[PDB]
């Protein structure tokens, strides 16, 4: 349920960016959208925070409990390690989207 | 390296024809000649039809046809807790024993 919420919102913000930039889907050609597009910027930031498990957003009440249960169970050691690394990589690619789409100077056509 | 004179001339002529063709593709003020033959009100007609008629039909179907045969609608029995009042028989489910309470 929680993932339905914030992932749908993230895809809608991505689509808004695509439409405003003439069907461009490359973060290498996005840029400056933090100030260019205020509402989609704040929506995508809130969604990416909720995705990564901000302490009291919609993703905290599921992902945090899942990680707690995985750590506290009689589990596969390799599965536990891969789960933790995947949480780190989730934060990583959310950072990549934000950094390459919204921060910096523009790269889109004039 | 560049256009030959024949390539340049043919491109010029073809582009002139193409522009003329698109200009002809433009429509006329009269062109789509069709043959002869409040916000709350719209959602009020929508709500009665789309919500009211189906709910009437479905409630009639369930109350008088589906639930007229055994085991068609099975409900999970309600939870009963200590110190409860069973409404069916006016019964009283007793409370639990005293907890060994801490702090």
């Amino acid at each position: 349920c929680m993932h339905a919420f914030f992932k749908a919102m993230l895809f809608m913000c991505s689509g808004s960016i695509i439409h405003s930039l003439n069907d461009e889907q490359d973060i290498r050609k996005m840029g400056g959208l933090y100030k260019a597009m205020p509402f989609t910027t704040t929506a995508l930031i809130i969604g990416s925070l909720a995705l990564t498990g901000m302490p009291y957003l919609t993703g905290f009440y599921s992902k945090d409990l899942i990680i707690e249960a995985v750590n506290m169970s009689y589990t596969n050691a390799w599965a536990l390690l891969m789960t933790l690394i995947a949480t780190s990589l989730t934060a990583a690619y959310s950072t990549r989207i934000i950094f390459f789409a919204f921060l910096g100077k523009p790269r889109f056509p004039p | 390296s560049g256009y030959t004179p024949d390539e340049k001339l043919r491109l010029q002529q073809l582009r002139e024809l193409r522009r003329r063709w698109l200009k002809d593709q433009e429509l006329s003020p009269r062109e789509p000649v069709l043959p002869p033959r409040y916000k709350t009100y719209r959602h009020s007609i929508f709500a009665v039809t789309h919500v009211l008629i189906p709910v009437w039909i479905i409630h009639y179907y369930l109350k008088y046809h589906v639930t007229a045969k055994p085991y068609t609608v099975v409900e999970r029995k309600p939870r009963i807790f200590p110190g409860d009042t069973i409404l069916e028989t006016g019964e009283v489910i007793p409370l639990m024993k005293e907890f060994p309470d801490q702090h």
Binding site: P38, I45, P55, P110 | -
Partner: protein
Amino acid sequence: VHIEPRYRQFPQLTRSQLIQAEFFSATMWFWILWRFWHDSDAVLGHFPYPDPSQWTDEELGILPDDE
């Protein structure tokens, strides 16, 4: 509202969208702070974790080695 296209310039923005974005970012941060003020146990835990080293052999029912 009609937004005129810009060429090599920052696009025209709207007061409504600026205030809406600011209000919702502020709403998220207020919610996070308000939840942390009240429900801080969800992040930092609620009950202490016992140290098994401090449990006496008498209370764990371990007899002296010689016995």
